[PDB]
Structure formats: structure tokens, C-alpha cells
A paper describes a structure:
As part of our structural genomics effort in targeting novel protein families, we determined crystal structures of three bacterial proteins from a previously structurally uncharacterized protein family Pfam PF08000 [also known as domain of unknown function family 1696 (DUF1696)],11 which appears to be involved in the bacterial cell envelope stress response. These structures share a common domain that is surprisingly similar to the eukaryotic PH-like domains, thus providing the first direct evidence for the existence of PH-like domains in prokaryotes. PHb1 and PHb2 share a common domain that is structurally similar to eukaryotic PH domains, which we have defined as a PHb domain (PH domain in bacteria). The PHb proteins form oligomeric ring assemblies of different sizes and symmetries, providing an excellent example of how molecular architecture can evolve, where the general form of the molecular assembly is preserved, but its size is expandable.
To our surprise, these structures had similarity to eukaryotic PH-like domains that we now define as bacterial PH domain-like proteins from group 1 (PHb1) {[name] [PHb1(sl), residues 9–124] and S. amazonensis [PHb1(sa), residues 1–125]} and from group 2 (PHb2) [E. sibiricum 255-15 (PHb2, residues 13–204)]. PHb1(sl) (residues 9–124) has only a single PHb domain that consists of the canonical seven β-strands in two β-sheets (β1–β4 and β5–β7) and a C-terminal helix (α1). It has an additional short β-strand β0 that connects to β1 with a large loop containing helix α0 that packs against the β1–β4 surface. The final model of PHb1(sl) contains 561 amino acid residues, 1 chloride ion, 7 (4S)-2-methyl-2,4-pentanediols, and 322 waters in the asu. PHb1(sl) and PHb1(sa) form a disk with non-crystallographic C5 symmetry that is normally only encountered in viruses with icosahedral capsids. The PHb1(sl) pentamer buries a total surface area of 9080 Å2 (34% of total surface area, 1816 Å2 per monomer). The formation of the pentamer in PHb1(sl) is mediated primarily through hydrogen-bonding interactions. β4 and β5 of two adjacent protomers form an antiparallel β-sheet, consisting of five hydrogen bonds between their main-chain atoms. As a result, the β0–β4 and β5–β7 of the next protomer form an extended eight-stranded β-sheet, arranged like the blades of a propeller (β-blade) at the base of the pentamer. The second contact point in the pentamer involves α1 (residues 113–121) from one monomer and the 310 helix region (residues 25–29) of the adjacent protomer. In PHb1(sl), these residues include Asp42 from β2, Asp55 and Gln57 from β3, and Lys63 from β4, as well as residues from the adjacent protomer: Glu80 from β5 and Asp86, Asp88, and Glu90 from β6.
Numbering used by the authors:
A (entry chain A): 0, 9 to 124
B (entry chain E): 13 to 56, 61 to 81, 87 to 124
C (entry chain D), D (entry chain B): 12 to 124
E (entry chain C): 10 to 124
């Protein structure tokens, strides 16, 4: 449960530009409250903020080449969301993410396939 | 036998722009779908799992045999994917396709 | 002791890749090391000793490192350890006196390095 | 550029590959991050004299994923984590305020993605 | 105390397990153990003692070396340790580099063949 909001990629590109690769482009980005899940043409950037003021911030880059396998499991009911599991090389447990209402569930999967296969 | 024209229709939206269905096998009520880029294990109510294993992530594999059992080991992890290939499954075909598409 | 590869190509044909060919093979008691242009296939049988047959395919890129340890003993037995990508524990194979231990090592070198 | 790369190339040359060349370097207080065409070299000094020196090479092809997180009092510092092929635990480097944390991130992106 | 090893002699010894296209680059002996750099791999040769009949030949292709480190004790105290991380092995191989070793050349060799 909870909704994901699409993020404007022109503004995001200006704000992330300094930590982006010279030939990197943004494909897709979602916000969930303060956190962001960013698809570039080279990696996922997972931006997680912690604390009341949200000043404890991490940027976790997951290059697509580190995603060794992945899975989508459809929701059983309208009340539930589909689930994305991403296995990252060297990490035993998958990163599990709810494909919240508001996400392009098929586009997300197509992007991972476009950049990771 | 799996209707590949139909399956290609249903999986079409989650395929890579440069990706196309090649072959599929039924293994019980589940499916092994082979595209040009990955093996998709489709296991089933309204709840289905689509587990993609890119060919480039398969490090080694083994078939032991009577039913057979397939282990597919994946880059960056200890544990294999394990699949029972019961009498009825095209065991030789699955092995040929793994060889053709990964090696 | 020598493996007839023409016969072996015919037996393995159904699981080989369309671009794959056999290069060399070595018998180890009832088991075989089959080197193709793409992979080592370790074929393990129990034969009279059991029901199991295992065809274990190791593409050469997945061999991360390897070791041969020999007995300091009259038996002249050796042991091969193959470490395969993603596993910390080696696949281990006893190579008893009579095995072409040197040959298997040179071939692992030629195909994996 | 933080440092004179022509000088640095002369200094590091003896431990660099014949077809390896320096790209960029960053000071991390008394430590250094040296980016070549093939690896990141972390040059770290220990002790008040800095007599104990380590050169830790991480080839770009071995970096699987990475993370930068805020650290320290009032989140003014940063911590870089580099995960490396074939191991669970990351290489962790503390990047204290004054370091070009943004530049280092861009350069890792440029060389590892 | 490490001794340098004659490579023409060693090539004759190791030739039967070497790749047809492989060549020896550098080798050190401590008692009867050897650390061999070829152009394709490290070979770690471990014999128990001075006559212990058992021997281990551990081959580490350069591709399996995921990262590596040289740390030195001092500005004038030249003892050094080489650490080599091998894919899938948690602990690094640690080689002490004391008298008789060429610490620069070892580093050059690893850079040339691993990178
Ligand atoms: Cl480490």
C-alpha cells in the first residue's frame, strides 16, 4: 500500500548531474514520500533519507550488470501491489520493492530488461 | 506443446526492445520460457511469478538422473536454482537449449 | 583407457550446443572429464555401485581457481579442487594412480587461462 | 585538478602497467584516491608520521555496486562503500568534509558503469 | 628471506602442467615453497618441509584476483605485505615481502597481468 509519484526528469537531471556519468541519462524516476528510485541507462540510484529532518541520506548505485536475476510476482488482490525482487551480486537476500499504485509496472520491467539483459 | 504465438503476445510488454521469444517448455503447471536474452521461469490463483535469469548470469549447471533434477547456478551467489524435471518433461531439449543459448 | 571421441560425440550429441565440439576426454575410473570447446562436462556414474548419473557442465569462464594436491605416499593418488564462480567450496575429484593427472591439468590450463 | 598528474605519473610509474595511465586523483585529507584507466588506487597513510603506507588497488571491472552516505556530526562528512566481486562486505572509506565527494562519485560513475 | 628462482629451470619442471601459450614471469622460493607469477596465473606451490613428499599446486588465474594491496612498515623500514583477494574466498592471501623480494617488480607484474 501507498502511492508512488513520478518525478520530473528534467529537474532531476539538473540536480543529480554532478554525480552522474558523462554519458548517463535518466530513464525513469519515482518518489515514495522522501525516498527515490531512479532508473538511469547505466544503473539504479536508490536515494533513501532517514531521521526526522531527512538529513541522513544515502545514494546506493546498482549498475544493471550487478543484477544477476530478478522476479516480479503479481498482486493477488486489488488491495495488494506486485512485488519486484532484484538479486544483487554478492548479496544473498534480494532487494524487495513494492510496485506501488502509480508505477508503470510493465515499463519498469521493460526498462530492467532493456538495460540489464 | 506451448503456443508460442500466444505466449509472445502475453510476455510482449515486458520483453526488451531487442528481445524475442524463442522456445518454451511446460514443466508440470509451470513454464520454462527461453528468449534471446534470458530464461523466464513462470510459476503459478491470481498470483504468478516471472523469474528472469539472464543467460550471462548462468555460471554452471547440472542434470542428475526416473526423473531428473536441474541445478542452474547464478553469478554472485552460493545457492543454485533447483528444478525437478519429472517423467514427461523434455529433459534432453531443455539441456540442448541451455547449451545453445548460454554457451 | 583411451576415450573414443567419435562414439562420445554421438552419445553426447543431444545435449551439446549446435556450435559445440568435443576436444578431449579422460576416464577417471567410471567417471569422465569431457572437454568441449565451451565447457568441461564432468560425467559421474556409480555404475554397479548405484543408480545415479550426473552431467555437470562447467563453462571455462566460471572456473575461478584450481588446485592439484598429490599424495606423499606409495598410492601416488592426487586430488583436484575446482573453484567455480559464486561458490567458496571447491568441487573435489579424487584422481587415483592411473589417471592422466598431468594431462587433465594441462588441458584445464589450455582451456581456462 | 587537485594534483600535478605528470608528477604523480612519474611517482607511480614503477607500479603501473605498461599500458596503464593516470586519469584523475583526489586528496582525502592526507590520503589519496588515484583513478587510472584500469583501477582505483587508494593510497592511505597511518600514524602521525604517515610512515605506514598502503596502496590498495580496486580494478573497475571488480566493482559490483557502490554507495555514498552522509556521516559524522550533523551529516557533514560522507562514507563511500565499494562492493567487490566475490565478497559480501564492502570496502568502506570515510570522506571527511573538504574532500571532493561529488567529484569522486562522478568519476566512479564514469569508470565503473 | 626469499630466493629468486631460475625460470629456464622452473619452466622445465612445470612445463607439463603449463598452458601451451603460457610463460613464466617471476618466481620466489622460501624453503621448498614457491610463489610463481606466469603471464596467465599465480601458482602457489606448497611442499611440507624439506622432503615432505606431498605437494600442492594452487593456480590462481589473474582474473580471479578481485583486488590487491601492498602495505609497507615504514619510510626506511622496507618490510611489506602483499594481500591478494581471490574471488569467493573471504580472507586474503597474505604474503610477507622481506629480503630477496623485488616489491616494485611484484607490483609491476600484477598490474601488467591482472589489470
Ligand atoms: Cl576489503
Amino acid at each position: 500500500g501507498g502511492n508512488a509519484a513520478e518525478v520530473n526528469l528534467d529537474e532531476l537531471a539538473q540536480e543529480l548531474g554532478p554525480i552522474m556519468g558523462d554519458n548517463e541519462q535518466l530513464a525513469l524516476a519515482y518518489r515514495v514520500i522522501r525516498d527515490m528510485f531512479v532508473f538511469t541507462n547505466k544503473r539504479l540510484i536508490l536515494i533513501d533519507k532517514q531521521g526526522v529532518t531527512g538529513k541522513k541520506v544515502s545514494y546506493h548505485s546498482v549498475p544493471y550488470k550487478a543484477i544477476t536475476h530478478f522476479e516480479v510476482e503479481t498482486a493477488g488482490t486489488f488491495d495488494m501491489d506486485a512485488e519486484l525482487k532484484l538479486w544483487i551480486s554478492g548479496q544473498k537476500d534480494p532487494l524487495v520493492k513494492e510496485l506501488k499504485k502509480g508505477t508503470d509496472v510493465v515499463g519498469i520491467q521493460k526498462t530492467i530488461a532493456n538495460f540489464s539483459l
